[PDB]
Amino acid sequence: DEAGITGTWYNQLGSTFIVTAGADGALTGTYESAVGNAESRYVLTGRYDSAPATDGSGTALGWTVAWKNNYRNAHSATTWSGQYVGGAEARINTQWLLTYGTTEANAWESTLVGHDTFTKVK
Amino acid sequence: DEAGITGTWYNQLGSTFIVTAGADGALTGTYESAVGNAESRYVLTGRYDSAPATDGSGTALGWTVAWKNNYRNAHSATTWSGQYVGGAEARINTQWLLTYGTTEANAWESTLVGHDTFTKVK
Amino acid sequence: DEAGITGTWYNQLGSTFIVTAGADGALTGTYESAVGNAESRYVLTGRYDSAPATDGSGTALGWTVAWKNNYRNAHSATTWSGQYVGGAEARINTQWLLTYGTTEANAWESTLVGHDTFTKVK
Amino acid sequence: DEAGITGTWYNQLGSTFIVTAGADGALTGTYESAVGNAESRYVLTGRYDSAPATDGSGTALGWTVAWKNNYRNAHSATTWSGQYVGGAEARINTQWLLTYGTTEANAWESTLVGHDTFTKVK
Ligand SMILES: [Ir+4]
Ligand SMILES: [Ir+4]
Ligand SMILES: [Ir+4]
Ligand SMILES: [Ir+4]
Ligand SMILES: [Ir+4]
Ligand SMILES: [Ir+4]
Ligand SMILES: [Ir+4]
Ligand SMILES: [Ir+4]
Ligand SMILES: [Ir+4]
Ligand SMILES: [Ir+4]
Ligand SMILES: [Ir+4]
Ligand SMILES: [Ir+4]
Question: For a disulfide at D11, which of A48, A72, B111, D116, Cβ 3.0-4.6 Å?
């Protein structure tokens, strides 16, 4: 699924995920969020199963963005965990954890959870 | 926190996280899980806030492991999202999402969630 | 939103959530899952914000099902946390945690996470 | 585990969970949070597995608090999902989802996730 995953993806929020899948299991690219304390592109890196089951199962993958670039620093990081599903309407279905840096007193309230679905068309 | 993060960390399960933090926000290393469908080391990559707040807040970070190496393929990936807290007893406090590849029918049951705390001593 | 919430709801899996919202903030009803180790109806109870903001915000709510009834016992419980959104296409948008009973050794793998969206039509 | 669960529990934040477990699987009680937009006691309800496995597994359970009482309304609800572990140092180990009411535009940022461990001594 190197070919299937590599490319430009869009989620339901209007965010843009640009990724290259390497033969070895690497994910590298950029992410641009349509929402939040974010502007322009941010580095992302991650990993995917480069030899997935051939029983029609999805391909497990995940990636991280730290929300610091040359424009802004939101002192936070999001990780997406999910699976790539190939076919006519390819999809990456994810759930995510967004942690922001906090004091120890506020650590209980440091992590948001959500879900994003990416497609190859906006 | 490049110096603070780089090194060998251990969680409550007895897993070993070996990481290098780059000046640019990169995380690269290996992970060895004490539990699950896992043996020996797996590649990890991730990101951290390389210019965190100086108000005593933690440093946000995250990373991904795809559970394929030369020994096993568990057709799954975990992402950890959390913060590094420096000091005498440094800690990385995380929550994680483990997704495994599934059929579309079983996708509702594809993702485990948990929490790991890493310290510099086992 | 007592009137808005009370009734029969369906999610994307084909599950059926039958709920009564009380004036005091109570949720009581039954849940029937289309998937998993489940058959027929299970008791549910929960709570909702009975005086929500009137700035167009959703109404926060949550509920629990333990997966034991007269037919089956899956030694597990799910909680849904989410918000009710009123209007022509009313929705309850949720994320959920499903914990199953485990040994202490397997507790790291005890909890699934997902997301369900309920509507008033299947 | 009716007897084991019923009583007063405390988490790592200093919150107080007061619960009665019914023979039928009901949980009913009050919760007082040491943190957040909260004061005094809030109603809780939930469910537990009233016939758990006898292979040394934990007992699955969950409960909900809507954060409205006579003092405050935080327009939010938390659900805890977890398992009760009996013995000399009884514990309830949970993960939780806290959703607050939002506009549709801000729904992506509506849900916090965390983990609480309750014991019978503070
Ligand atoms: Ir395989
Ligand atoms: Ir999903
Ligand atoms: Ir959704
Ligand atoms: Ir700052
Ligand atoms: Ir935590
Ligand atoms: Ir813990
Ligand atoms: Ir209000
Ligand atoms: Ir959602
Ligand atoms: Ir969805
Ligand atoms: Ir059993
Ligand atoms: Ir846990
Ligand atoms: Ir913890």
Answer: D116
